[PDB]
Amino acid sequence: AKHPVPKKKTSKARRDARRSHHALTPPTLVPCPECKAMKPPHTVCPECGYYAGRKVLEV
């Protein structure tokens, strides 16, 4: 609300394009060594664990 106003209603086309560059990006995961399942690259999954395994305390 000022001087530079959206003079006209923008089309559905523009809606979908400005929202074309939107989108998501999928997660990135690898396995957990000395374990079984995933862990994102460079992590110490609580269930699993990096080298030496720290924490791992859940139920």
Partner 1 sequence: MEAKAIARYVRISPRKVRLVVDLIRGKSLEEARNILRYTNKRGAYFVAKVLESAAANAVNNHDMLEDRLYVKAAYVDEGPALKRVLPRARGRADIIKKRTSHITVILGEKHGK
Partner RNA sequence: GGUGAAAAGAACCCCGGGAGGGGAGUGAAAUAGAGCCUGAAACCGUGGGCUUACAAGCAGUCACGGCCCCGCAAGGGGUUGU
Partner RNA sequence: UCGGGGCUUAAGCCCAGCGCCGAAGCUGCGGGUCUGGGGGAUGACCCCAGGCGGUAGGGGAGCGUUCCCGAUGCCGAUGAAGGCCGACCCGCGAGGGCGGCUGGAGGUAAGGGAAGUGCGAAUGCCGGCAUGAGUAACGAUAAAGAGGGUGAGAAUCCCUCUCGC
Partner RNA sequence: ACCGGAGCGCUGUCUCGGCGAGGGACCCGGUGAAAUUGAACUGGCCGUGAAGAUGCGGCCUACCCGUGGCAGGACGAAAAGA
Partner RNA sequence: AGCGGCACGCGAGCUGGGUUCAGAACGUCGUGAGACAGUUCGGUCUCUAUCCGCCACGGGCGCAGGAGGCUUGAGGGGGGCUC
| Residue 11 lies near RNA (rule: CB under 7 A) | yes
- Give residues 1-59 in contact with partner 1 (rule: CB under 8 A): 22-27, 29, 37-38, 40
Selection from RNA, partner 1, none that 55 binds (CB < 5 to 8 A by kind) is none
Measured CA to CA, the distance from residue 53 to residue 35 in angstroms comes to: 11
Instruction: State the Cα–Cα distance between residues 52 and 37, nearest whole angstrom.
Output: 18
Q: Which of residues 25-54 bind RNA (CB under 7 A)?
A: none
Region of 13-21, 27-35, 38-46 interacting with RNA (CB under 7 A): 13-21
Residues recorded for the chain = 59
